[PDB]
Design a protein around this nucleic acid. Structure first.
Ligand SMILES: [Mg+2]
Ligand SMILES: [Mg+2]
Ligand SMILES: [Mg+2]
Ligand SMILES: [Mg+2]
Ligand SMILES: [Mg+2]
Ligand SMILES: [Mg+2]
Ligand SMILES: [Mg+2]
Ligand SMILES: [Mg+2]
Ligand SMILES: [Mg+2]
Ligand SMILES: [Mg+2]
Ligand SMILES: [Mg+2]
Ligand SMILES: [Mg+2]
Ligand SMILES: [Mg+2]
Ligand SMILES: [Mg+2]
Ligand SMILES: [Mg+2]
Ligand SMILES: [Mg+2]
Ligand SMILES: [Mg+2]
Ligand SMILES: [Mg+2]
Ligand SMILES: [Mg+2]
Ligand SMILES: [Mg+2]
Ligand SMILES: [Mg+2]
Ligand SMILES: [Mg+2]
Ligand SMILES: [Zn+2]
Lengths: 75, 53, 187, 159, 104
RNA sequence: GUCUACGGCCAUACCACCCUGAACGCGCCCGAUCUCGUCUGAUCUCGGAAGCUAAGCAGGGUCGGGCCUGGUUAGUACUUGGAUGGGAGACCGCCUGGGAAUACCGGGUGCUGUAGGCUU
RNA sequence: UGCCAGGUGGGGAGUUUGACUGGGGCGGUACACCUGUCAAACGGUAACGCAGGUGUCCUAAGGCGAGCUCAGGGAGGACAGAAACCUCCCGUGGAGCAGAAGGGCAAAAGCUCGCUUGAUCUUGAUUUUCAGUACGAAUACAGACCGUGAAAGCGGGGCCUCACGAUCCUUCUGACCUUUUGGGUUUUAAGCAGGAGGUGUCAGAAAAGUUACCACAGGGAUAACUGGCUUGUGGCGGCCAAGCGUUCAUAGCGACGUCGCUUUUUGAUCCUUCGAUGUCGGCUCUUCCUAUCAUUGUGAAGCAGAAUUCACCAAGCGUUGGAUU
RNA sequence: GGUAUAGGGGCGAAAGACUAAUCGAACCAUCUAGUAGCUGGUUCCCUCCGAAGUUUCCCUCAGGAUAGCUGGCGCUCUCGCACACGCAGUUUUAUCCGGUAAAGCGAAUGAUUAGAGGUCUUGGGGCCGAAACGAUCUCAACCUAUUCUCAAACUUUAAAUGGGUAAGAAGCCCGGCUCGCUGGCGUGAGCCGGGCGUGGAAUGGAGUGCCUAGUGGGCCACUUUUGGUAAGCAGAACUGGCG
RNA sequence: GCGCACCACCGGCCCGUCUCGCCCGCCGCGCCGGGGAGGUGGAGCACGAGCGCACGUGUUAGGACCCGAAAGAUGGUGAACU
């Protein structure tokens, strides 16, 4: 009682019935699989981002004032 | 046969359990009989507490 | 002879509530009129959420509603909930809020009225704000039920954190060959 | 049935071309690969370490990780039902920059130039590409000479 | 295969590379009082015959060699097991073979 | 025009023979106390500047081989899709598109980056 | 005699006696793996397809650094010749890299040296088969101890593609580790983590036959008939013409080659039939076919007569009695 | 006629024979509605959607588990409510991959035919020679320029068909902060602020989550193709059908 | 602009384990107890959603959609045939 061994005859129709999908690309992909040293450095950099925030605030305020002055000069 | 993530269950129904099924249709009659016996015992000891010692 | 697939022609979304209670039917009729007539989409959202089932409108906690109303800008606005407002016991200070919900718990109702807030029904909301102006629409956590902890990637699969269906948790019921590196392998 | 060997069927795929054996040129070793760089993988038989699998040969992916002498590339792979975005570690010698994205970058820069320019002019320029249009009807001038006749050639057996 | 009698490798207790003595690991005695052995003896007692399987389909003709590395540093004497690929001939200090000689 | 040191692409750069090299440079070359290694200062290493283009090296030449790039081969071989096309078959023609490779015949025989020389 | 212990004990009891398979058995492993082809220029793809290989081996045949070039050929030198050793030249690798094959490698990945044991300890991530689960194998990292080289660097086994193993149990190694239950100490024991002892039917039962005295549930998924496709084989018929025929290829034959027909032989297939289609022969009887043995009518001769064979229309009518099986 | 031997027992001049029409283990009742991956059957209507005989594992091959195909229930959003994101058994424009068809063997490996020039080399039969590479050919493996025919496990070349990516807002251009990483200054990555929108053609509304039956014997055909003389034979690839 | 629910990512917290370390307290100063940083393992936290009843579907243990063996065991009846 020998039977059929292997085939791929009807498989393509089954694959294409339910809309074969390209993998869903999502913004901000995960960081799994990256070297630990680089991740450690990134974590340390993000840990101290809050430090020296007033410098960023002052620089942003100065830039906003300069942009407003430039807009007024243009007008 | 398991099928796509069901619990692993082990029912204890491999003996002849249907031979020893205990119904509870006697429950209201049992309660009535107990109440009648309790009232009769309370009446037997007229001044003593019905609860007991 | 036209080659068109008919497998996705019938949409499955609800058109009417499955419940047979008559007060919900009256609210459904009122908001059907409001949504089909007024151009406001708030009435459409309220109608759709009224059609939803019990699990699709999870209860909203008092603390979560207070925190959402704490956001700047949405001050002096009426809270609109299509679920049930439930009391939260691990919070002490409750401000005054205007809330609209199908059901309010007795503890939550007492605490809201004690603080000086107002509790309204949807028929009162229609009279007060027929177009839903000046209202904040909120809902409870949809994924709050314990069923979703069992959903997703199957247990016994690498990088999976799904709770398996176990009769009882213990030392000798699971966490063996398949989960121990000393017993065969682990995922 | 066939064997499950990793390098089965790679007799010619992982083979150096004709008269191109020997020392690997050093230009490929000193090319940088930033994150988000589109890269096409081509295996090289000279280097055995960091060898990509035969199914990724000729595929194109994006770099997401970098090591001392290898990079991590996410490459789409179809397995009988779907396309899987999977990440692999490939050494530098089997890695080269893809030139598909540079044409798009050049067109983007040209479009930005054409947007900054001709803006004060007021005339909007065509930025979108278009397929080949009709051949812009013209005149053909047969000065003097008449067209040459081309009669069919009678058959003759040559073999 | 041939391996030397001394092996200067890492020592977990010392924390550094130390010379180690190389000896071949051997099976010990069942001790007659392990929980599994006691359970097996209780199960085999009485009637019913043999209760557990007896393997009778040996296929492999060799066993994996295990090396017993003992730290030679005093006050440590830490042992460790190392397994090497299967081989049917093993020795210690076995004839370093003096490459480039006359064979007879 | 050109050379040296480090290179990039790795024969348009290779191979065989012949001719020419002004200056710097590159080498041949002169020795083994010190450094160093050999059966041998042959190689390597070190110490030098009496001779030389003899050789390497650089340029040029061969109705040169090879190599690179074209024509021919050829719309040929082959090939996607089509027919209630032919033929007993083997196979073949047509419609709709793509399109090779030998023999044979032409052209060419390294460009170039950094730093430093010579022709001042 | 009663109770234990060892031996014997098909007298008796229970059970087993794998799978694939152009039916089954026998034969083989296509049952776990690796190389080239099949395989139709991504990948993947079957047959008891083709050519093969594996269950090993290596203290160096692993890891570094240095120095050389191999196979082969030519020209020479006392014994010395085709092969002993030395010298020069040519030598893209035509040698070697343990094995089967493929790929790869020339101041190497080959040969010779010097030093070593990265064949060490520990978290994760990924690749191969894949369900994208394990095992094995491998790939980039990271944290310590190192080896080597002046250094850049290289190395956590073999240049790469294979060389191997779950639960339970036992054994070894490690922590001033946890419990050993009313408490305390000490032996013992149970745990935690990492190796080994093995399941070759290799995701892993503990397993001998016979039944023609046989039984049950099924199967035309599967054999022994006929009937179906095919015609290797069997049988029959042509095409060319080297030769036999005393001379002369074709009166009669016809090699070396080649084209056909039939299912009156055996074969290949398993399409119908296993809730049953009664088989080998012989006897009796009817009909049909012609690939004609004889008779009717004719063509040909190595046809003189007789006889003989070749061929044509032609199945109307005949094709016997017995010994042996 | 009386009596004795009763079911793993009896009895047997031995046939597995007889033991109440049953004997290679009698009859009666119960365990028992024993088990069956194996046959057969499985009861009203209409409407809507609608399959597979395929991958992996199993003492697995008449069966299961697991992926695949199917149905149901939803949910999150966009809008012919003058005002569109995103996806495709498509094509176009760019940019990578291959080693099959073909072709070649005057190019490598292997097979192989025949003539010209070679004491290249040596050797066998031989002839003119005591012999002589002195003359003449011949057969051996080789060479120098030619020549005939080949390769699924050969190849310098090399298609058609085909397989990945890119065709913008998740993109660019500036300013400033953080870093136990790497560095002579530098990198590289991550954080905040600001400015710039139709990114080839044509067609589609999409995304996402739970349960889930049946299936897991297939067959045929154009084309490519393996074994076999061939087969309405056995076995593969693409597509389309019957089922 | 405030931004539900939800999704993706980056951070934070809890328990086990590994590495490097600096300090805190006492009734009993010890083989005492506690804390940090950096990886990793968990069916976790990160302002909740369960409980009870009823209905439907799917998987099981039961006789288990219905009918069907060749068998096995316990207790009894037969030599009126042979
Ligand atoms: Mg009481
Ligand atoms: Mg006993
Ligand atoms: Mg027996
Ligand atoms: Mg069988
Ligand atoms: Mg091929
Ligand atoms: Mg293909
Ligand atoms: Mg070297
Ligand atoms: Mg390391
Ligand atoms: Mg017999
Ligand atoms: Mg059949
Ligand atoms: Mg024949
Ligand atoms: Mg006559
Ligand atoms: Mg008998
Ligand atoms: Mg039944
Ligand atoms: Mg079965
Ligand atoms: Mg539907
Ligand atoms: Mg339909
Ligand atoms: Mg061909
Ligand atoms: Mg059917
Ligand atoms: Mg279920
Ligand atoms: Mg029955
Ligand atoms: Mg039995
Ligand atoms: Zn030690």
């Amino acid at each position: 009682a020998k039977s059929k061994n292997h085939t791929t005859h009807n498989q393509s129709r089954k694959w294409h019935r339910n809309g074969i999908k390209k993998p869903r690309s999502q913004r901000y992909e995960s960081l799994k699989g990256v070297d630990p040293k680089f991740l450690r450095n990134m974590r340390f950099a993000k840990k101290h981002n809050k430090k020296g925030l007033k410098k960023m605030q002052a620089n942003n305020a100065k830039a906003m004032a300069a942009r407003a002055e430039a807009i007024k000069a243009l007008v | 046969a398991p099928s796509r993530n069901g619990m692993i269950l082990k029912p204890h129904f491999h003996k002849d359990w249907q031979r020893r099924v205990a119904t509870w249709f006697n429950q209201p009659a049992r309660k009535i009989r107990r109440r009648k016996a309790r009232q009769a015992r309370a009446r037997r000891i007229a001044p003593r507490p019905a609860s007991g010692p | 002879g036209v080659d068109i697939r008919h497998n996705k022609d019938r949409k499955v979304r609800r058109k009417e509530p499955k419940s047979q209670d008559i007060y919900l039917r009256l609210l459904v009729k009122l908001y059907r009129f409001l949504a089909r007539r007024t151009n406001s989409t708030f009435n459409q959202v309220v109608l759709k959420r009224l059609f939803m089932s019990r699990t699709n409108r999870p209860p909203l906690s008092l603390s979560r509603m207070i925190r959402k109303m704490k956001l700047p800008g949405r001050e002096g606005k009426t809270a609109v909930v299509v679920g049930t407002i439930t009391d939260d016991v691990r919070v002490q200070e409750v401000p005054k809020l205007k809330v609209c919900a199908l059901r309010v718990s007795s503890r939550a109702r007492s605490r809201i009225l004690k603080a000086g807030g107002k509790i309204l029904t949807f028929d009162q909301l229609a009279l007060d704000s027929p177009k839903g102006c000046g209202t904040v629409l909120l809902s409870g956590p949809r994924k709050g039920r314990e069923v979703y902890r069992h959903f997703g990637k199957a247990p016994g699969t690498p990088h999976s954190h799904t709770k398996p269906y176990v009769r009882s948790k213990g030392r000798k019921f699971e966490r063996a060959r398949g989960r121990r590196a000393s017993r065969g392998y682990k995922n | 049935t066939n064997t499950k060997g990793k390098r089965r069927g790679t007799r010619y795929m992982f083979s150096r071309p004709f008269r191109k054996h020997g020392v690997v040129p050093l230009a490929t070793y000193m090319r940088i690969y930033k994150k988000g760089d589109i890269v096409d993988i081509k295996g090289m038989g000279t280097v055995q370490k960091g060898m990509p699998h035969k199914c990724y040969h000729g595929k194109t992916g994006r770099v997401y990780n970098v090591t001392q002498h290898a990079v991590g590339i996410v490459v789409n792979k179809q397995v009988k039902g779907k396309i899987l975005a999977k990440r692999i570690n490939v050494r530098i010698e089997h890695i080269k920059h893809s030139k598909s994205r540079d044409s798009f970058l050049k067109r983007v820069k040209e479009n930005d130039q054409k947007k900054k320019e001709a803006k004060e002019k007021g005339t909007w320029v065509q930025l979108k590409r278009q397929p080949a249009p009709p051949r812009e009807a013209h005149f053909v001038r047969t000065n003097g000479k008449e067209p040459e006749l081309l009669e069919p050639i009678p058959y003759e057996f040559m073999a | 295969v041939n391996v030397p009698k001394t092996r200067r490798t890492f020592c977990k207790k010392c924390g550094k590379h130390q010379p180690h003595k190389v000896t071949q690991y051997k099976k010990g005695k069942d001790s007659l009082y392990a929980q599994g052995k006691r359970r097996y003896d209780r199960k085999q007692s009485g009637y019913g015959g043999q209760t557990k399987p007896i393997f009778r389909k040996k296929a492999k003709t060799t066993k994996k060699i295990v090396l017993r590395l003992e730290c030679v540093e005093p006050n440590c004497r830490s042992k460790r097991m190392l397994a090497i690929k299967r081989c049917k001939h093993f020795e210690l200090g076995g004839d370093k073979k003096r490459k480039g000689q006359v064979i007879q």
